[PDB]
C-alpha cells in the first residue's frame, strides 16, 4: 500500500499576546479529517471529512479533552525547552509533533511514527523498533530521559500497534468511497513560445489523489532533472492535487521531448508529449 | 483517533 494515519500537533508560544496556542489536525492518508484550535471561543474538535461526522458524542468529548489536556501540557513543554536552551522570556517558540501509523497486512501496524521538532529542527524521534529514541542534541537527551523514566515508548507503542491501527481501518471502512479510490491525474502538455529559438513545454497533472506523483521531462528518453522546473504539488481544495513540470526547449525540437507520469491511480506509467 | 490520555498526568517534553 500503504494507508496511514497521522496527527500533526503545533504548539506555539507568544509572550505578551497570550498563553501558547495549540493546533492539532488529523489525516488519514492525504485527507484531513479533524482539527482542534485552542484559540476558539470554546475550543472543540471539529469534523473536516464527511465520513467522520457519523461518530457519536463520545468521539467529540474524547478528542476535545485529549487536545485541551495536550494544550496545557504543551505550555509546560514550551517552558521546559526554553529552560533547556536558556532562552529569553520574550522570544516566541514552536514545538511540532507528527505521530501515526502505516497499515500493513492483516490490519497490523506496518510502521509506527512519533517525531518532534523545536523551532523547525528535529528534536526527538521514536525509533523504528518502537522501544527507543534518537535525541538530536543534549537538550533532547533531557526529554529522552523524562520519557524513558515514564515508559512513554511502551505507552505510545500500545497505541500504534492497537488503537491507531484499529481506528485507521475503521475510518477507511467508513470512507472507503473516497479514501480507497485513487484519483488518477488528468494530464496534458501545453506549449508557450519564449522566443524564435525557444519554447516552454509544461506537463500538467490535475485532479489526482493521493498527492504522491512523479512528473519527469525526458529529452530523448534521458532525464531532464538538471533544467526541469517543478512546482510543489498543490491542493486544488476539492481534496485533489495539481502539479506541473516545465522545461524550456529549442524551437522545432519539441518532439524529442517526452513527459513521464507516475501515479498510484495510473495502472501503467504515462508517456506524454505535445500534440498541437 | 488521537492517543488517549494516560490514567495519570501527561508527560511533558
Amino acid at each position, epitope marked *: 500500500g500503504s494507508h496511514s494515519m497521522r496527527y500533526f500537533y503545533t504548539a506555539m508560544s507568544r509572550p505578551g499576546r497570550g498563553e501558547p496556542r495549540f493546533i492539532a489536525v488529523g489525516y488519514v492518508d492525504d485527507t484531513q479529517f479533524v482539527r482542534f484550535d485552542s484559540d476558539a471561543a470554546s475550543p472543540r474538535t471539529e469534523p473536516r471529512a464527511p465520513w467522520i461526522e*457519523q*461518530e*457519536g*458524542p*463520545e*468521539y467529540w*468529548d*474524547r*478528542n*476535545t*479533552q*485529549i487536545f485541551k*489536556t495536550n494544550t496545557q501540557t504543551y505550555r509546560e513543554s514550551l517552558r521546559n525547552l526554553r529552560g533547556y536552551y536558556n532562552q529569553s522570556e520574550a522570544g516566541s517558540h514552536i514545538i511540532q509533533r507528527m505521530y501515526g501509523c502505516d497499515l500493513g497486512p492483516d*490490519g497490523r501496524l506496518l510502521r509506527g511514527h512519533d517525531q518532534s521538532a523545536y523551532d523547525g529542527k528535529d528534536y526527538i524521534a521514536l525509533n523504528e523498533d518502537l522501544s527507543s529514541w534518537t535525541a538530536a542534541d543534549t537538550a533532547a537527551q533531557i526529554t529522552q530521559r523524562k520519557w524513558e523514566a515514564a515508559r512513554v515508548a511502551e505507552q505510545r507503542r500500545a497505541y500504534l*500497534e*492497537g*488503537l491507531c*491501527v*484499529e481506528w485507521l481501518r*475503521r475510518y477507511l*471502512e467508513n470512507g472507503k468511497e473516497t479514501l480507497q479510490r485513487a484519483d488518477p491525474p488528468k494530464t496534458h502538455v501545453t506549449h508557450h513560445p519564449v522566443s524564435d529559438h525557444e519554447a516552454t513545454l509544461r506537463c500538467w497533472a490535475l485532479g489526482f489523489y493521493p498527492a504522491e506523483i512523479t512528473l519527469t521531462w525526458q529529452r530523448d528518453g534521458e532525464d531532464q532533472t538538471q533544467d526541469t522546473e517543478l512546482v510543489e504539488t498543490r491542493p486544488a481544495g476539492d481534496r485533489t492535487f495539481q502539479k506541473w513540470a516545465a522545461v524550456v526547449v529549442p524551437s522545432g525540437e519539441e518532439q524529442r521531448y517526452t513527459c513521464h507520469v507516475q501515479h498510484e491511480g495510473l495502472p501503467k506509467p504515462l508517456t506524454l508529449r505535445w500534440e498541437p | 483517533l*488521537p492517543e*488517549p*490520555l*494516560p*490514567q495519570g498526568q501527561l508527560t511533558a517534553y
Partner: antibody, heavy 111, light 113 residues
Framework: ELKVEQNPLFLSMQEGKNYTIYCNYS?????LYWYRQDPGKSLESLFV???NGAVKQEGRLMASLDTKARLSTLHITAAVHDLSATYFC???????????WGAGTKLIIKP | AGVTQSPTHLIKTRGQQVTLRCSPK?????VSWYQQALGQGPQFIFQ???????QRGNFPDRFSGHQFPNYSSELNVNALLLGDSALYLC????????????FGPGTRLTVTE
C-alpha cells in the same frame, strides 16, 4: 443494531478445571468490557479490550478480542469457588456512550 | 475515592418520585446511569458530561438527570411504575483517557402497590 450475546447463560464447573465463556457482538466495537457481578452486589470491572488481538490476563481470568470474528472470550483457569458470579460483557460502538450488555454468564464453581 | 452512590435503597409506591445521587471516582468527569432488572443485563439511561446530557437510551421523560460542576450527578425518576423496580447503577470514566469505567454500589429501588 449493535447486539451483544453471551454464551452459555450458565456454566457448571469443577474447581481446578479450565473453561471458556463467549461474547459475540454484531457491529464494530469501540470498547469491549468484562464485568463480574456477585449476588445482590454491583459490577466489578475486570477487562477493557480496545483493538484486535488484545489479550489481558488478571489472575485466573484471561480475555481476548477477535474483531474479525466479532468475538471475545473469557478463559477461567484453575477454577475456584470464589470465581462464582455472573460475568457480563458490554460493548460500545459508533463512538456512542451507550453500551449494549450481554445477558450474562452465571458461573457455578463446584468443589 | 471510588464511585459512590446514595441512597442504599428506596421503597416507593406508584406515582411517587425519587432522586438518586452518584459521585464519580476522583479523576473521572463523566457519569453513566443504568437500570438493571432481576436476572437481567444493565440497560443504559443516560451519560452526563460537562453538565450536559450527552446521550440517552430507551428511557422516557420521567427519567431526568443532572450533572453538577464538581462532576457529581443526580438521577430523578417521577411517576414511578411497578416496572421501575431495579438496581439503579452509576458508572464513571475519565474523558479521553484509558477507557476504564467503574460502577458505584448501586441504589436498589422497589416500587410496590
Amino acid at each position: 443494531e449493535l447486539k451483544v450475546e453471551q454464551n452459555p447463560l450458565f456454566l457448571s464447573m469443577q474447581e481446578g478445571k479450565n473453561y471458556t465463556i463467549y461474547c459475540n457482538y454484531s457491529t464494530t466495537s469501540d470498547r469491549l468490557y468484562w464485568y463480574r457481578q456477585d449476588p445482590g452486589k454491583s459490577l466489578e470491572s475486570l477487562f477493557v479490550l480496545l483493538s484486535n488481538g488484545a489479550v489481558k490476563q488478571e489472575g485466573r481470568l484471561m480475555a481476548s478480542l477477535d474483531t474479525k470474528a466479532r468475538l471475545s472470550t473469557l478463559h477461567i483457569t484453575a477454577a475456584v469457588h470464589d470465581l462464582s458470579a455472573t460475568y457480563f460483557c458490554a460493548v460500545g460502538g459508533g463512538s456512542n456512550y451507550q453500551l449494549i450488555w450481554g445477558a450474562g454468564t452465571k458461573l457455578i464453581i463446584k468443589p | 475515592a471510588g464511585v459512590t452512590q446514595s441512597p442504599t435503597h428506596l421503597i416507593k409506591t406508584r406515582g411517587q418520585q425519587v432522586t438518586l445521587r452518584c459521585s464519580p471516582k476522583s479523576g473521572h468527569d463523566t457519569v453513566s446511569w443504568y437500570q438493571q432488572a432481576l436476572g437481567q443485563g444493565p440497560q443504559f439511561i443516560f451519560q452526563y458530561y460537562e453538565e450536559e446530557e450527552r446521550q440517552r437510551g430507551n428511557f422516557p421523560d420521567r427519567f431526568s438527570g443532572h450533572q453538577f460542576p464538581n462532576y457529581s450527578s443526580e438521577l430523578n425518576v417521577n411517576a414511578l411504575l411497578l416496572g421501575d423496580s431495579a438496581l439503579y447503577l452509576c458508572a464513571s470514566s475519565r474523558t479521553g483517557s484509558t477507557y476504564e469505567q467503574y460502577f458505584g454500589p448501586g441504589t436498589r429501588l422497589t416500587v410496590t402497590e
